[PDB]
Design a protein around this ligand. Structure first.
Ligand code: NA
Length: 306
């Protein structure tokens, strides 16, 4: 067992969702609580800290390292901090103060300074599974979930302007650039902001998910039996694997269009290969696995009684 764990998520009312999911997976072995800032009024009881984002939580992190020198500090690199730690002094200070660093995919520790890697640990994110649905051989529907690399998808859709056999469904809140692409191109559609249940059903129902960004969406696709076409950036490669066959160069719309065309051609195949490759990735995103990685991390951070 019963350590008192504090999760720092300084998000304004991504990281909140992770924080809540970690609290639920750790609640069986610890008294877990989420805060925006530490310390608070219940802070004298806390023994272990899991702070999300080396910069946004730096002030909590620094407060923890003063009250608990060499004890209980886990700092989670959520993305933009890892890819901040180049110039940000606070981000850098957070890396040095931590007893443990958490990266969320395999490749994270390569961006970490050399002296910070031994204390890094890989904890893949997790999501619930959806059943893999049968898919038509007569079209290829691609879904992209991403608040408005928007231009990369936009350019690929214009390079495919006449095709109605390749359909691109863009989900996300922004805008007129999207509405224009929707009027001009039969196969592009901007559905705007959609509820979370509808977004996951469309991903489950899509032949493929396209991610051009430089993470939860990729897990939701993989765990719903939907392959992914993704930009070759470390965050994505860490999720899908160094030998994944569905990568496109970041900012290369022609390469993205070619990849959709190749998926379409093998219908009736690259798409079948991508499906097989994603099914081998899916067990990395099992809640059981994330929970187990968290248990071990908590046993490592747990400080001996003062
Ligand atoms: Na508990």
């Amino acid at each position: 067992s019963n350590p008192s764990l504090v999760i720092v998520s300084p998000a304004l009312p991504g990281n909140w969702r992770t924080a809540q999911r970690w609290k639920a997976l750790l609640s069986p072995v610890c008294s877990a609580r989420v805060v925006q800032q530490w310390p608070d009024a219940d802070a004298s009881a806390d023994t272990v800290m899991l702070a999300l984002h080396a910069r946004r939580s730096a002030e909590s992190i620094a407060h923890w390292a003063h009250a608990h020198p060499g004890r209980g500090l886990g700092v989670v690199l959520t993305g933009t901090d890892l890819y901040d730690i180049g110039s940000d002094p606070q981000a850098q200070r957070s890396l040095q103060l931590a007893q443990r660093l958490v990266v969320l995919q395999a490749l994270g520790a390569e961006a970490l300074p050399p002296e910070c890697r031994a204390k890094a640990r890989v904890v893949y994110q997790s999501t619930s599974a959806r059943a893999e649905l049968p898919k038509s051989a007569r079209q290829l529907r691609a879904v992209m979930v991403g608040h408005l690399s928007p231009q990369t998808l936009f350019d690929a859709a214009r390079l495919l302007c006449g095709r109605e056999d390749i359909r691109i469904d863009h989900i996300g809140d922004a805008g007129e650039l999207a509405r224009a692409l929707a009027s001009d191109c039969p196969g592009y559609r901007w559905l705007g902001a959609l509820p979370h249940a509808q977004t996951r059903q469309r991903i489950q129902r899509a032949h493929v998910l396209v991610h051009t960004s430089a993470a939860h969406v990729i897990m939701e696709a993989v765990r719903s039996g939907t392959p992914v076409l993704a930009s070759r950036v470390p965050g994505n490669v860490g999720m899908l694997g160094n030998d994944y066959a569905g990568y496109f160069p970041h900012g290369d719309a022609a390469a993205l269009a070619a990849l959709l065309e190749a998926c379409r051609a093998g219908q009736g195949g690259l798409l079948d290969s991508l499906r097989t490759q994603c099914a081998l990735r899916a067990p990395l995103f099992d809640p059981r696995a994330e929970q187990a990685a968290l248990f071990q991390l908590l046993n490592e951070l747990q400080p001996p009684p003062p």
